[PDB]
Amino acid sequence: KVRRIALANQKGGVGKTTTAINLAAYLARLGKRVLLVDLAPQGNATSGLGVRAERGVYHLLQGEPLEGLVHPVDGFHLLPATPDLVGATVELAGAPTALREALRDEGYDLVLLDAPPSLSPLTLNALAAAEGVVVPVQAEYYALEGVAGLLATLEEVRAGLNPRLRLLGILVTMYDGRTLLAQQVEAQLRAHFGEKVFWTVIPRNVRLAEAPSFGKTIAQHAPTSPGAHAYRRLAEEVMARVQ
Amino acid sequence: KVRRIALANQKGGVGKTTTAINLAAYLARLGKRVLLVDLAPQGNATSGLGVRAERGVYHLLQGEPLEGLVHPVDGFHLLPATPDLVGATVELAGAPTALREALRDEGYDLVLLDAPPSLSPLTLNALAAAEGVVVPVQAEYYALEGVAGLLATLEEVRAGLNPRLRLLGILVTMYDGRTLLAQQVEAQLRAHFGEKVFWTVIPRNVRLAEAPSFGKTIAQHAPTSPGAHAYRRLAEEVMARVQE
Numbered sequence: 001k002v003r004r005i006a007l008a009n010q011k012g013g014v015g016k017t018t019t020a021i022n023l024a025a026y027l028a029r030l031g032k033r034v035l036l037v038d039l040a041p042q043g044n045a046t047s048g049l050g051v052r053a054e055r056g057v058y059h060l061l062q063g064e065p066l067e068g069l070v071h072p073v074d075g076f077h078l079l080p081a082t083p084d085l086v087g088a089t090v091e092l093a094g095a096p097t098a099l100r101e102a103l104r105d106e107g108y109d110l111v112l113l114d115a116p117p118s119l120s121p122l123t124l125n126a127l128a129a130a131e132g133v134v135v136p137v138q139a140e141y142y143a144l145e146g147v148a149g150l151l152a153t154l155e156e157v158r159a160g161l162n163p164r165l166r167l168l169g170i171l172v173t174m175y176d177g178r179t180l181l182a183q184q185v186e187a188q189l190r191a192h193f194g195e196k197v198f199w200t201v202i203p204r205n206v207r208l209a210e211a212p213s214f215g216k217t218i219a220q221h222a223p224t225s226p227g228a229h230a231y232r233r234l235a236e237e238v239m240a241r242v243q
Numbered sequence: 244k245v246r247r248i249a250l251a252n253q254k255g256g257v258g259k260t261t262t263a264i265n266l267a268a269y270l271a272r273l274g275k276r277v278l279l280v281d282l283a284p285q286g287n288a289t290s291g292l293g294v295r296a297e298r299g300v301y302h303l304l305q306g307e308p309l310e311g312l313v314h315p316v317d318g319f320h321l322l323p324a325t326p327d328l329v330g331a332t333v334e335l336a337g338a339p340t341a342l343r344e345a346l347r348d349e350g351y352d353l354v355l356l357d358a359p360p361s362l363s364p365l366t367l368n369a370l371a372a373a374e375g376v377v378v379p380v381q382a383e384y385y386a387l388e389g390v391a392g393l394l395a396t397l398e399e400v401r402a403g404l405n406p407r408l409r410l411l412g413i414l415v416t417m418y419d420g421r422t423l424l425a426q427q428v429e430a431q432l433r434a435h436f437g438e439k440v441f442w443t444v445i446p447r448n449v450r451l452a453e454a455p456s457f458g459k460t461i462a463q464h465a466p467t468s469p470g471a472h473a474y475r476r477l478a479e480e481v482m483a484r485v486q487e
């Protein structure tokens with residue numbers, strides 16, 4: 001069964017963090033105990049939740065107990081990114097299972113891993129520790145162009161590094177239905193990957209970008225906005241696919 | 244003087260590639276001989292210009308002649324990314340000056356280096372080889388939040404790795420003036436960094452995102468669109484700053 005879900009895509013700015021935060025927010029509202037782990041050196045998920053920490057996931061890898069590293073936020077827990085992740089990108093080379101072996105998260109129902117836009121050791125650790133992968137794909141050309149290669153890479157990972165890793169689903173994000181490009185991109189994704197693509201599409205709406213500046217999830221910042229409804233529906237879909 | 248300009252920002256999707264391609268397009272139209280080097284493993288600048296090559300910057304780093312690796316596109320030259328760059332990220336670790344030493348680009352007026360969203364050896368090589376840096380900053384919160392740290396990192400590089408590296412300017416990108424968020428972000432950027440922020444703001448306009456799907460620059464795809472006018476004005480501003 002799927003417990004750990006990685007939000008991954010080496011393409012930058014396709015909604016990995018926004019999805020990790022808001023998926024956690026609505027999964028928590030479904031009564032699930034959720035842990036959000038920020039593995040990006042940039043630490044956007046952490047900053048977007050109003051947290052500034054000196055200890056986080058980096059220290060978990062150094063033997064520190066999980067319980068004393070988490071921060072309570074909007075109904076779930078966050079294992080924060082710290083400036084140490086910069087060096088961790090190098091230190092973890094050759095150690096892709098480090099996170100998997102340090103994640104004593106049995107107390108949680110679901111664990112979300114937010115990865116940086118790369119195939120660095122941090123992203124590899126996320127993929128090696130996860131059971132399912134949600135791939136956010138921005139409704140534009142560059143993001144669409146990288147899917148084929150991205151899916152092949154996930155297969156390489158499942159080939160030996162993590163045999164139980166599976167694609168939970170492809171999520172169309174930052175979708176503006178008024179543009180032909182967004183329509184054409186969603187169409188190509190559903191034509192080639194069919195059921196792999198989530199039904200729910202995340203629409204482009206500025207409240208989603210505003211939320212982080214207040215350290216709030218979309219459920220806290222604009223509970224009735226298009227993005228809120230979209231992520232609420234996604235949480236339901238995710239649970240359906242996990243079951 | 245400034246010849247090599249890096250388009251860098253570890254924040255993903257802030258317009259590095261879109262800016263590198265369109266800036267090259269308008270600099271070429273100003274009569275400049277331009278070379279665009281795609282250092283991102285993703286290879287978006289390459290794909291966005293309709294190029295699919297088996298040899299590129301990786302082979303340049305191996306010692307192969309630059310003139311036999313470039314592709315002519317929209318009036319300028321492209322030194323393409325190749326699947327070999329995935330392994331280059333690991334190969335260049337410890338060799339931050341590899342690109343600088345291999346860039347025999349004296350035949351070009353300007354050289355643009357498109358870096359990936361990270362501080363990997365590829366981005367480091369870009370910073371160690373460039374004289375100026377154009378930092379694209381999406382008009383939203385996350386991009387704004389990273390600027391301080393980014394400028395600090397640029398200073399570190401100048402403090403040792405590359406003393407000639409200088410911030411050419413901060414470019415506000417994907418700006419939708421109809422949103423209060425975009426307005427507040429540009430306002431804060433100019434309040435905190437003033438003159439460092441380019442006058443030219445790139446507006447959010449879908450044709451800029453469409454162009455790459457046709458392997459065309461915005462100057463080819465939609466020359467009279469908001470994005471095209473913006474990048475044309477930017478090319479002029481960059482030249483003005485390069486001359487200063």
Ligand SMILES: Nc1ncnc2c1ncn2[C@@H]1O[C@H](COP(=O)(O)OP(=O)(O)OP(=O)(O)O)[C@@H](O)[C@H]1O
Binds near residue numbers: 011017174209360
């Ligand atoms: N649906 C949306 N509508 C509007 N703004 C959005 C939406 N999804 C995300 N954003 C904004 O777009 C930007 C890019 O998203 P985000 O930072 O989540 O991507 P990643 O997390 O994909 O990026 P990176 O590659 O840097 O880790 C952010 O400024 C974010 O607030």
Ligand SMILES: Nc1ncnc2c1ncn2[C@@H]1O[C@H](COP(=O)(O)OP(=O)(O)OP(=O)(O)O)[C@@H](O)[C@H]1O
Binds near residue numbers: 142258360
């Ligand atoms: N001003 C704009 N208006 C509309 N779309 C834009 C604009 N600038 C760029 N885009 C689109 O936004 C996405 C992100 O831009 P781009 O890929 O150039 O960023 P980077 O090059 O910042 O990304 P990465 O971090 O992955 O290298 C692309 O799909 C691009 O086509």
Ligand SMILES: [Mg+2]
Binds near residue numbers: 016040044115
């Ligand atoms: Mg992110």
Ligand SMILES: [Mg+2]
Binds near residue numbers: 261288359
């Ligand atoms: Mg890019």
